Amino acid sequence: QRGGVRQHLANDRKKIVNLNIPFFPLDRSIDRADIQNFREFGTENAPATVDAEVQ
Amino acid sequence: AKAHVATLEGNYSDIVLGRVVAFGDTGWNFKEVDMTFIADDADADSKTTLFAGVLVGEDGTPATAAAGVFGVLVDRKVLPGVDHYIGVFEPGEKVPMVLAVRGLTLNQLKLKYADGTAIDAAGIQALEAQGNQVTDKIVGTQFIGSVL
Amino acid sequence: AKAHVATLEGNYSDIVLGRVVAFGDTGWNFKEVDMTFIADDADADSKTTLFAGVLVGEDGTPATAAAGVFGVLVDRKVLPGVDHYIGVFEPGEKVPMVLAVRGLTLNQLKLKYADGTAIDAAGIQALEAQGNQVTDKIVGTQFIGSVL
Amino acid sequence: PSDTLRDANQAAQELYVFFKESNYLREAKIESETSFLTVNNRPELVVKSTGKF
């Protein structure tokens, strides 16, 4: 109604949060026995080499 | 792993919506009282049960009945997001508190008795005698999800 | 009125003084178990009561006497200066925890039983049999007020 | 009109917005007023249809 009381406004919301993170390892080793007398399997006669397994 | 979450709703200017600001003085509307902050039987680390809008009588004891309503607590230590007073005061300690008394416009959605009850008609009529406007008539808000 | 103060003393290295590093495997010394992070009777989103150094059995339950001692709790989640996990785990839930059981130079003073009692001789013997050194040769520290 | 002595009998306007900063540097307020009526002069020409499924 004209001349009477007015109205008033409201307010908004706020929020906050936190989070963690996981971890993923991976590893392998190399031993002498894996290369001693085994051929380079992809060829006729060449002996096995360490780098061929590292790669 | 439910995340640690914090929130906020509401400001100071939601119980107090306007004054009759006096020229000569600015403290005309307010009054100071001494109230028990931490219950005098609980422990130090207990958080205070006082909240903005809780009715207070002439003495510093929030009222649960119409016959003792005097003012509305609007102290700055109990506003949203202000909490850093865990354990600052020993149980049974008394702190000076501010009360709105006269010359103010008050929202009745937030006025409540000490136990959490809403303000009844008798409480309103007892608070208007001080010279206060009890509005209601508030727009509110609707957030995402509502079509409007 | 009291003031708010927080303090920090001690680190990870103060419990694990020395470690034997195996060239071909870095995780040799440690073993994972599962533990009840929040006691099943704890209030909704309480604070845990585990701490670094508490002796636990292989099952994961904290040990009360020598027979139940298998390793030392050394997880990152319980170091003195860390606080993230409040309410993150529901009461009675279990989360993997890291123990250290092989090849360590362990402090003797920091290790505690489930109830906070200091480590006895039988527990020391049981922990040593696994292949761990228990030594109390710790210099200590003096801060102020005493002419060192 | 806006129901204000400044223009109580002038031509109306769609929306009034007042920003009043109180001089004594302790409070401020925002006010806004609007008034209008919507009229459907020919209700006979609108037909509603209920759909049965």
Side-chain angles (χ1 to χ4, degrees):
Chain A
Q1 285 285 309
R2 286 206 170 214
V5 60
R6 296 191 175 255
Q7 300 177 110
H8 317 93
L9 179 64
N11 61 6
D12 60 357
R13 296 152 160 184
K14 290 153 188 153
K15 188 172 176 181
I16 183 173
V17 68
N18 308 292
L19 303 168
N20 307 321
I21 302 177
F23 182 80
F24 299 99
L26 185 76
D27 178 0
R28 185 161 177 60
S29 45
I30 295 169
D31 190 316
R32 314 156 211 164
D34 298 317
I35 177 164
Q36 183 55 88
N37 282 333
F38 307 114
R39 293 180 181 178
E40 188 59 85
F41 174 57
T43 183
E44 268 274 2
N45 181 276
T49 65
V50 61
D51 191 8
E53 303 206 38
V54 167
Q55 304 312 323
Chain B
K2 43 198 296 167
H4 179 275
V5 62
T7 62
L8 200 73
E9 286 137 32
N11 288 319
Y12 181 76
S13 83
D14 309 325
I15 310 92
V16 166
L17 289 165
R19 316 200 224 170
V20 168
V21 302
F23 165 69
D25 181 38
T26 73
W28 181 61
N29 313 104
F30 301 113
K31 178 193 183 190
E32 282 211 347
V33 294
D34 180 54
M35 291 155 58
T36 294
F37 190 78
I38 303 307
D40 66 296
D41 48 2
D43 83 329
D45 290 334
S46 285
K47 293 165 192 93
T48 185
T49 184
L50 298 179
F51 55 92
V54 68
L55 297 163
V56 187
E58 287 80 30
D59 50 357
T61 52
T64 50
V69 171
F70 180 70
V72 169
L73 165 60
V74 290
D75 181 23
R76 286 205 180 174
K77 308 174 208 70
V78 190
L79 310 184
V82 171
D83 182 17
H84 57 272
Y85 286 80
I86 190 167
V88 173
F89 309 107
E90 302 97 339
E93 182 65 26
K94 325 194 76 67
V95 63
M97 281 275 148
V98 183
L99 308 188
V101 188
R102 63 197 153 265
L104 288 166
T105 295
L106 299 191
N107 167 7
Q108 83 168 348
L109 306 184
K110 284 191 163 181
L111 304 186
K112 301 186 195 310
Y113 285 110
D115 58 354
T117 304
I119 191 66
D120 67 76
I124 297 163
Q125 292 199 289
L127 189 140
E128 295 200 63
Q130 314 299 321
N132 280 301
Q133 171 82 317
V134 177
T135 60
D136 196 74
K137 292 199 172 196
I138 297 169
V139 165
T141 305
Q142 276 173 46
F143 310 89
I144 182 158
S146 179
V147 67
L148 308 159
Chain C
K2 300 198 200 69
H4 177 58
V5 296
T7 57
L8 160 66
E9 281 266 330
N11 295 320
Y12 180 77
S13 170
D14 292 333
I15 298 153
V16 180
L17 300 169
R19 186 171 83 85
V20 67
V21 301
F23 182 76
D25 184 7
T26 290
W28 182 66
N29 312 109
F30 310 105
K31 174 170 182 172
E32 309 193 316
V33 305
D34 188 33
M35 301 165 138
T36 307
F37 197 90
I38 296 295
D40 207 2
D41 313 333
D43 60 42
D45 294 332
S46 200
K47 283 298 299 298
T48 192
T49 64
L50 286 167
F51 54 102
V54 66
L55 306 191
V56 300
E58 160 172 40
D59 188 40
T61 298
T64 61
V69 173
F70 171 82
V72 173
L73 170 57
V74 177
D75 194 294
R76 268 172 151 126
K77 294 178 217 76
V78 289
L79 299 179
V82 176
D83 191 7
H84 301 154
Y85 317 90
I86 181 177
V88 182
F89 306 107
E90 65 183 1
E93 199 177 355
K94 314 197 174 171
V95 57
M97 291 286 208
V98 175
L99 303 184
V101 290
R102 273 81 54 85
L104 309 155
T105 298
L106 292 174
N107 184 330
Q108 181 174 2
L109 314 177
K110 302 268 181 159
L111 316 186
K112 300 285 167 296
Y113 283 120
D115 64 347
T117 299
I119 188 174
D120 300 309
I124 287 160
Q125 170 61 98
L127 182 53
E128 204 164 60
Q130 309 299 308
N132 292 295
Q133 180 171 227
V134 191
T135 184
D136 51 22
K137 186 254 290 179
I138 311 184
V139 165
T141 180
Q142 305 187 66
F143 298 125
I144 189 160
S146 59
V147 177
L148 73 165
Chain D
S2 80
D3 175 15
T4 285
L5 176 62
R6 181 166 55 78
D7 77 333
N9 269 279
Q10 305 297 337
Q13 188 169 319
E14 62 295 9
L15 173 64
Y16 307 97
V17 168
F18 310 123
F19 182 54
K20 194 192 191 143
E21 164 295 310
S22 292
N23 227 355
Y24 310 126
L25 314 184
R26 298 201 189 289
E27 290 156 327
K29 200 171 184 193
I30 300 161
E31 297 183 327
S32 75
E33 289 149 345
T34 186
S35 43
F36 55 76
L37 183 74
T38 309
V39 191
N40 179 336
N41 291 319
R42 300 222 64 190
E44 305 147 343
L45 268 48
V46 177
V47 170
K48 91 181 186 77
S49 174
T50 294
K52 175 179 159 201
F53 319 119

